[PDB]
């Protein structure tokens with residue numbers, strides 16, 4: 001298995017030993033980065049002329065003049081051959097040679113190579129990642145890990161643009177980075193170069209830019225500073241802004257000025273990219289002509305980014321033809337997956353799919369906007385790298401599995417389990433969803449329908465659910481203690497905790513279904529209620545960000561199954577034994593009687609009704625009561641209003657109804 005899969009491949013049945021004795025040809029000529037990889041693979045240090053010849057170099061080098069005709073005439077292309085007599089590692093360019101070695105490293109198994117002929121090259125010119133999300137920007141160590149990962153998977157582009165980096169966006173995009181950050185960026189660029197990645201530094205000046213000489217000069221001054229730090233590719237983002245900065249004429253003029261007075265004046269600047277204000281069809285106003293202005297005015301060499309028909313969308317043939325006709329060039333795709341900054345309580349670990357596989361020539365580039373969880377994003381990144389290199393043979397599920405086995409080989413099956421049930425985004429404003437838990441979806445749907453209707457569920461379906469919950473617990477506990485990729489485990493641990501609780505709860509609820517006596521049923525019932533409380537605790541103490549705090553897992557299929565199964569069996573119990581057990585499926589320390597069944601939610605220091613009287617579990621100082629009588633007890637009482645730290649336990653009087661309290 002090779003990732004990305006090469007364009008052309010011919011395999012035999014011969015097994016070549018990684019030669020004890022080798023003769024290196026072209027070590028002084030070839031890409032130093034590629035040579036370093038090779039020499040590292042050759043600890044079989046017997047290196048005389050008496051050994052198996054190994055030819056490495058770029059097209060035009062003396063080392064590979066023979067195989068000149070086999071080398072693909074594409075940028076970043078290469079030719080690789082292994083047989084009994086000689087090994088060839090010939091790239092069309094230095095980066096092509098490097099990519100030949102990355103494939104060669106995958107072929108090396110058990111210290112023995114297969115007899116293969118490979119002619120390979122990318123179908124998309126620019127492939128990689130744009131760190132362009134809202135939230136905590138990737139740590140320095142995360143970014144270093146990312147760059148080495150890109151090189152291994154032949155991603156040649158990394159676009160730096162964290163929305164919450166103050167020196168990337170407003171107002172301090174005018175200011176140079178402090179010495180610490182500057183030294184770190186200098187290192188990143190160096191590491192990027194060592195891994196054949198283009199470090200593209202983006203700037204995001206649109207929100208407060210003045211279309212005058214001062215701001216223009218300051219932007220160029222900033223670019224000049226980044227250049228001194230080693231940056232050789234640049235970008236200007238105009239996404240998510242209002243006001244004068246949205247002017248297409250001014251944007252195009254600025255970019256063209258940057259191109260003509262900086263990009264072309266420097267001897268070695270590669271990529272120049274811009275992100276438009278209208279970066280998807282849905283936000284494009286047909287009443288005007290923003291995109292056709294950019295397309296006509298912006299110099300053709302300059303790239304224009306695009307997220308598809310919507311903010312979050314997959315790329316289609318009709319969609320890319322639509323934008324391309326207007327910007328007068330092939331779109332540079334900005335794919336908003338697996339970015340989760342609008343569903344921050346979810347991890348998006350599912351496979352990469354939905355993007356048309358035949359449109360490689362219709363795009364200038366393809367980059368993915370990831371989660372602020374860097375390691376967790378490697379699943380999607382690895383897949384995009386595969387897709388972008390050879391879209392014609394992109395295998396959705398095989399690549400997803402290959403990614404997981406690469407990222408965490410010591411616990412691949414456990415990570416698959418966790419990831420399969422952590423891929424959907426849940427409900428959101430963009431209406432973007434992904435498949436989740438499809439393996440067990442059919443058995444869950446049948447079981448619940450039969451159970452509710454009082455019909456007999458199939459034993460097979462029941463046992464599948466049992467197996468699933470059992471597997472989830474194993475996976476959760478093994479992942480917690482995994483020391484192979486510690487940074488990964490740190491990222492997902494809160495979800496892994498919630499994942500195990502979900503599985504434990506599922507087991508206990510199934511036992512309530514099997515329950516044949518009252519005492520045992522009650523024991524299980526009390527255990528479930530305690531587990532609910534534990535999930536609440538994690539939801540309130542982990543991932544407490546300002547936007548979607550907490551931790552949600554297995555939301556598409558499994559949590560609804562358990563909740564609905566728990567509610568149903570409790571109803572049956574109350575009917576049978578004339579009891580009044582609470583069939584609530586989510587713990588809530590507060591109460592709200594009156595909408596009669598609308599549940600309360602605790603988010604940070606806020607108590608709210610899901611879009612009348614509320615009773616808190618205690619007396620708190622009140623902050624305010626936003627909306628769209630106060631009391632400490634039911635005796636004495638007193639589009640928004642404040643509380644001024646007054647003691648509150650009861651409130652009395654739907655798009656929002658939120659009580660904020662002090663902590």
Ligand SMILES: CNC(=O)C[C@@H]1[C@H](O)[C@H](O)[C@@H](CO)N1CCCc1ccc(F)cc1
Pocket residue numbers: 132133134239240275279307311334336339341342369
């Ligand atoms: C190509 N550029 C973008 O995709 C811009 C932004 C950021 O990159 C963000 O990571 C991504 C997905 O959340 N986009 C969300 C945009 C929605 C949004 C909705 C309402 C708003 F008020 C502001 C932003």
